[PDB]
Amino acid sequence: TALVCDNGSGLVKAGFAGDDAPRAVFPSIVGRPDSYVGDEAQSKRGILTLKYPIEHGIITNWDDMEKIWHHTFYNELRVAPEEHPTLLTEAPLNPKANREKMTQIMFETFNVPAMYVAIQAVLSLYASGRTTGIVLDSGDGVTHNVPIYEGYALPHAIMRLDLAGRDLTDYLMKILTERGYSFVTTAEREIVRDIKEKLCYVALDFENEMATAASSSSLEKSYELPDGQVITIGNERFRCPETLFQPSFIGMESAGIHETTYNSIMKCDIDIRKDLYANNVMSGGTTMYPGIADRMQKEITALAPSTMKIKIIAPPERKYSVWIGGSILASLSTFQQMWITKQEYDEAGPSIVHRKCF
């Protein structure tokens, strides 16, 4: 049975084609004092330093990436890779040389019988039961707007924003520090990440919410640190993710995610824009904030012509939408002849990936 591995900046999501979710989700890290990977690197981080092989969605350390994949096959999925066709995912606009490298490592290092690479955002659109739409995919490392028509991304219209989950975590840490707290270790970043995931939300109207926080204590929440100290989080709860709409909060001159969605749509043929506005699909961990869909609906409505039908689709399972799309694709009776086989690789070499995998 086929495997599905969705490799991200922050987390690996791995499993078997045909399952409704990944079997294992673990951090994309290698830690050294001879090395540990994933969940065990995380749990032993007291005595290790960590490296992340994927930066802003792109693999930049191939030797550590091989360790991550070994850990996925042998430690998490507990399979012999030579027995299983393997579907991997990639970022939009992934460099051509990277696609060839992934292919080469799968066949020559792990001896897979067959392999395929798919674009993450496109898998997410398929998981939502659509062939046309615009995906907002935001993880730990990178954010993209990917417009898609009749199954295929429109490359000229893709927007990439280097403002994602890790930047949000660092900013929450900055402003919580301003409130009087202190988070001096890399280990404590993981705590601030947890606060972010449990207590942050996107305000429908940012300036009104600030006024509420200033005139009442009703937005304040408590959070218990590992040493038992209970701290208070106020307007930081919604100031943190407001950064997605106002990147000037962390010094970036970029447009916020509402404006890049609009800019992306405006780069496409006027005849498909209506279908794009009606099919905005959110995927990835950083789209998980309560309130984000309602905020996006409001902001896009404000930018678009006033007769446009606007719809935001934010599935509850969207942390795993990419993975689920791959599970579905890999399971289809029609997909059997679409894999790159080991024989095809032996005859053609890694460049085969550009002809078999859009």
Binding site: G18, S128, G151, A187, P226, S331, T334
Partner: protein
């Protein structure tokens, strides 16, 4: 190579398939227009143009209770069929209760809904998230 792709769009008419456990299975001709609301279907309307060419409209119809594997598969099968037809099909998403007038016009005595359908192809799994938060002791270790 899939047998149903070989049959798709060869002559003018209507063809309907139902998604069944990650496969595209033809609907019996006498049941055309009776859609299970627990399922997802793919419909190809082939029209003979006066210039001798065939015109193709591909609709994927999503029942209100169809499972995620079914609606995802309907969408993907639609892309693959369109590609097999040299991109020449126009794709239409049809949701129960909101179907297009041209889709509705394919069914001369009116399309009808019935409850039920084929079971999901997904196996249900319990994801293990292995990303533990640091203890007091781990944080103290990094300080030193």
């Amino acid at each position: 190579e899939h047998p149903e792709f070989l049959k798709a769009g060869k002559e003018p008419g209507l063809q309907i398939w139902r998604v069944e456990k990650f496969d595209l299975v033809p609907v019996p001709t006498n049941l055309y227009g009776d859609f299970f609301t627990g399922d997802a279907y793919v419909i190809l309307k082939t029209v003979q143009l006066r210039n001798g060419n065939l015109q193709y409209d591909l609709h994927y119809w999503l029942g209100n209770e169809c499972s995620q594997d079914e609606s995802g598969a309907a969408a993907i099968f639609t892309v693959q069929l369109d590609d097999y037809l040299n991109g020449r099909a126009v794709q239409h998403r049809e949701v129960q209760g909101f179907e297009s007038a041209t889709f509705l016009g394919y069914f001369k005595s009116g399309l009808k809904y019935k409850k039920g359908g084929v079971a999901s192809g997904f196996k249900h799994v319990e994801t293990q998230e292995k990303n533990p938060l640091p203890s007091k002791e781990t944080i103290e270790q990094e300080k030193q």
